[PDB]
Curated annotation (Swiss-Prot), chains A, B, C, D, E, F:
Its main location: virion. Changing R174E: 90% loss of transcription. Belongs to the phlebovirus nucleocapsid protein family. Pfam families: Tenui_N. GO terms for cellular component: host cell endoplasmic reticulum-Golgi intermediate compartment; host cell Golgi apparatus; host cell nucleus; ribonucleoprotein complex; viral nucleocapsid. The keyword Metal-binding does not apply. It is found in: Virion; Host cytoplasm; Host nucleus; Host endoplasmic reticulum-Golgi intermediate compartment. GO terms for molecular function: identical protein binding; RNA binding. Keywords: Capsid protein, Host cytoplasm, Host Golgi apparatus, Host nucleus, Ribonucleoprotein, RNA-binding, Viral nucleoprotein, Virion. The N-terminus is involved in homooligomerization. This is Nucleoprotein.
Amino acid sequence: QELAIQFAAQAVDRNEIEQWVREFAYQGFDARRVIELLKQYGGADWEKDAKKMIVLALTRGNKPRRMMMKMSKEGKATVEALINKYKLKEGNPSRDELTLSRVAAALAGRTCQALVVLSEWLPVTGTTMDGLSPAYPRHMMHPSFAGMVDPSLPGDYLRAILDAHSLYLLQFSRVINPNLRGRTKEEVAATFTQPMNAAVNSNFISHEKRREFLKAFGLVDSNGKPSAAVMAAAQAYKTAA
Amino acid sequence: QELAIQFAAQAVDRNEIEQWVREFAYQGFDARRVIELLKQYGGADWEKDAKKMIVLALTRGNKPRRMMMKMSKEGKATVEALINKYKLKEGNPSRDELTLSRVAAALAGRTCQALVVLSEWLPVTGTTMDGLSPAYPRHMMHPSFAGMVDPSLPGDYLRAILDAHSLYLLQFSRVINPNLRGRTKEEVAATFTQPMNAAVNSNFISHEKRREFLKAFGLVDSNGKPSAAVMAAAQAYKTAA
Amino acid sequence: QELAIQFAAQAVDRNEIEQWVREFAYQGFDARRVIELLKQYGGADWEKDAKKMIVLALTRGNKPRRMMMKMSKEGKATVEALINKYKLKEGNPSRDELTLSRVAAALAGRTCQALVVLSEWLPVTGTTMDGLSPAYPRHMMHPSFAGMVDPSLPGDYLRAILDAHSLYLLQFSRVINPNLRGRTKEEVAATFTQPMNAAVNSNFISHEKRREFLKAFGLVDSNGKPSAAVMAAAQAYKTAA
Amino acid sequence: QELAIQFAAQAVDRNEIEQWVREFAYQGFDARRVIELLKQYGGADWEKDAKKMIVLALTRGNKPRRMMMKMSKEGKATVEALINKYKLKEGNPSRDELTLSRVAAALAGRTCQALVVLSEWLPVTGTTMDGLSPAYPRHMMHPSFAGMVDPSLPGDYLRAILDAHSLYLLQFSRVINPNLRGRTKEEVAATFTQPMNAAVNSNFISHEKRREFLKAFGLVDSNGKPSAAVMAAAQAYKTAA
Amino acid sequence: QELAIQFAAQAVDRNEIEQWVREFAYQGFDARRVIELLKQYGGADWEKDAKKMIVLALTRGNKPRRMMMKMSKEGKATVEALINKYKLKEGNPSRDELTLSRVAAALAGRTCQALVVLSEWLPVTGTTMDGLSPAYPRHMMHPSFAGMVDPSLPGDYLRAILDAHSLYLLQFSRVINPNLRGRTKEEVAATFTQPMNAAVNSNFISHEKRREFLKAFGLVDSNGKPSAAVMAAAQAYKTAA
Amino acid sequence: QELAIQFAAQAVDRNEIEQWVREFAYQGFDARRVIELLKQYGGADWEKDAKKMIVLALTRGNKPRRMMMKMSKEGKATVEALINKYKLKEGNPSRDELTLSRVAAALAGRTCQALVVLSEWLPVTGTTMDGLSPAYPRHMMHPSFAGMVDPSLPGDYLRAILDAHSLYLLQFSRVINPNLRGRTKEEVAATFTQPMNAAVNSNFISHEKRREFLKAFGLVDSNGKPSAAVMAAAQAYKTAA
RNA sequence: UUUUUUUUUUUUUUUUUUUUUUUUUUUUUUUUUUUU
């Protein structure tokens, strides 16, 4: 009956396992087919509407019918136009459905750049983040930044980017979710660490191209070492409450 | 399909984003509507009644029907006269509605000045605040002070004003809300930091005019550096329980 | 629309605000009404019955019908005689109504002196308070003592009297209220600090006359500095659980 | 109206207050009523049965019908004989009713002496108490010991006896009451301090006679100073968890 | 009425109290009844079946009908044969009833020796106990060990054996009782300290014979001083969580 | 009656006890039944499907119907075929039923080898484990590793492997179980230590064969001493929160 | 001298939240609690 030893003695095929992990992957976040659906509904005006949807998701939220209740007449007409065109939903729906958070996650490059302008209009302001860590990087102030993180970066550097980004996520998750307010750092960390690592390890946008974005935003140097601003934020998360 | 890199490589238009944030803005509070409604119901006697309502909201509270139960005959007639004229409500109602807290928040300048006289009649007395931080600024002893804070001030100075003001808010929020009494500093901070930052970043009263008020109250010097009293209160909040 | 600056630029009238704070004060002014009602129902025998009501409120409680259930035949007749004459009630009723706690609060001078005799008959004994702070002042062992506290006293000294008195209130509030037993020092403090400060800042009995009582009880010296017994009790409250 | 100063200036009559406190006293315990009922049901064999009831309450508990379920045939007949004769009950009944705890509390002198023999048969053994404080006084190992404590003893000495006695109460109350196990020393203190002080300040057995018992048990010397064993137990309670 | 002083002045009869404590003892003294019942039901094959019942109670538990559900066909027949012969029960039944835990408790000498062989088959393994205290005594790894403890041993030595044994009980009680998992060291201690002390102070097996067993197991030396392994485990309980 | 001493004086037969522990063992024989059922449903294609089920259980989870909801068309396909063939269930079912966790536990050899390829796809990534302990062993990244642990290894070495493996289990159990997030290290340890020790002490795969696997994975040397990576992870668990 | 638990637990690019929260010279509890 002890024939499992022979099954274990078998040489592991690296690519045979790589085929099944991509097949049995946690699908739902879409990312690559978000752009496929954006051009399907939007057509030619998909780029202008995507820019509108990034500002909308960053300042207000993910639920479009809830934010429409407390909004201006000018906003009410523009938001409803996007819901009836792109068939936008709220929460975590199917693979073929679109949400405001999914549009911001797929176009992570434009989203991170928009955070420099939209600094004091976010649920967690830049001044609040500056209090925890002096001169906190504005580009890290959204969960979609995890899609811009290069996993090929060295261990100490990769952890320094993720720990600095987790400082915002700790504050942000407690603001948007009221039942996580009383819960400790470790309890809050367990809710955002899983979708964060999934966005870093996603095959969408190559390792070299992702590294170029981090250099352009002024997060890492020519080699890959993070800036003093990132290092201070990563150290602040270690002693955070 | 990976054409999102080209969309991300695009230079972000600062003013194009500024147009949409004002369009998709959160329709809440608005200090302009309060003054517009005060002159609509009051007429000419709106300034004298506003002075009465600021003192009423400072010493008693926001609920007018609840405070009327335990009040003198002189007060009962004057308070009911304001409810039937200005159509005053309790809690968080619609944009077209008025509350005692909204009147005190819109006219933040007069409210701040009234705290110097009404020091020992507040829920949190000046002597109690003096125990935590020696010679605590009396002008910071109301959540409406956030509307007098200048966001154009340097980072270190802007945080010093907000941290000093948060020392009162920590004590005040635990007094008016009984379920926040047992909860830690971080838990209490999360409830008042959001409407505080919204009042600082609000377009009502220019950055230069707001800076003049802080100088007049004796909080900041000719340049913008806060006084020793403000600096001690900001340091006290860092080590607060 | 930004005309609130002109309303704020107005010079604050100290006495105009002083008129409205007394008008919009909590209830239709206490203490004075109690003595006015005591002479109205009692007549000439009001002083002897007040002495009886002080001993009754200090040893038993505020509810007269509840304490009558577990009392001697001699007590049952004397207590019922006071209820039918002075129309005594239980809890927090209207301005024109009388309670055993209100009689003890109005005549704070006689109440504090009675605590020296009635030391081991209180819910919190003198021996129990002497364990927390060596030689705890017996005169502070009732919430009515707040009416004998002089607010004109220097900041450091005024806080020393209130912190020493709060050490008793922390123990007393947890004894009379069972749901406050499990709650921390900060949670218990928030329930008694509000009516305590209201009795200190009350206009009943002059600042100079109140200072004379504290000197007579042996709490403060000829100038206003509290005794070693008061200073030790104030320090004990800072490290109290 | 400020004529309360004249009422307060009056010299407090020690004896006049002493008359009303005994008149308006709270009834719950019995002491005199217990012995009156023991001779009423027992008659001549009341002294032999009281000795049996002290051993029964000390080793087993207060509930007689519950302890009979897990007892020998010899015990079952003797215990039931006491229930049918003295009409013994369980819990906190009326003044005219008797319980095993009330018999042990009324005859505190015999109960404390029985603890020397019944040392390892108690819920909290003498060896367990020796671990907390070396050579712990055996006479203090029952809540009925509070009835033997002399309140006329000096402050430092009176607190030393109560703090040493509370060391047992802290362990015992957590053993019999399972919901008090998780609660801190201060939370446990609040449940036993009220009936403890009531027994100390009770008029049953004079101050001089109570002092003689403490001297006979070897707790205090010829003057009133407690022994090294009591002093060590009082110091152990101050640092107890 | 104060005639209790005369009743207390009476000389306490050591043996008169000793008669009633044995009469009013807790029905659990089955140490004699178990062996008496094993000889009645089993007969001559009682010694072989007792050895089987010790291994069964140590590895599985005290519920014979519950453990039979998840067991081999060979075990199912042997276990059911013991239940139908000795009339074995589960839980806490009457005096003249037998349970797997009662058989292991009565024959404590064989049970403790079986723990050396059955080390990794217990609910709490020997390797787990070695992590808390290096080289933890295997003979102490069962609540029945309390019946092998000599109470005539010196105070410091007696406490060292009990504190070392309590380290296992703390780990064991939390494994078998799931609601005790979240509860602190003090809460768990209160549940096992009472039946532990009862087994130590039990008259079954003389003080000298009990001391010989502890010497034979290698727990105490020729005089009575415990080994370095026992001393380390007693120190580990003091700093345990 | 005290004849238990003679029964205890008897020399314990090591193998006589070894016969009864295997007879009165928990369950039938798990791990053996899994392979027996895999060949029963699978037949010849059981080895290829087992490799697919290992990758599926490691990356997603134990519930097959829940993970199918958020998966690709290619993924939804291969998973549903395995449920209808092997009759796969979710949770803790009967002995004759199969789960994804049971397949991974029985074939522990290939499961440990799959973790060097699938490091960043696990709920707890390798980079996260590297932060707690530098260069954490990738073969210890699953609860099924306990089945590869050799119990015949020396005490200090055996504890070093289990303490290093417990570092992952502490992080993993808090990720998959949300109510264990707030609970301390000791509370989380009590839930995984019991099934861990059961897999180490299990008779499936001999002690010598298990030792060969740990040498092949690069965990222990030629004798049995663990590597510096394992020693650092075991030390990290001792100071872990 | 009781409690006898079980290779289990499989969570999720989302939980997107609001210038709000306005509490009270009040609260007046009782030699009890007796667990295995």
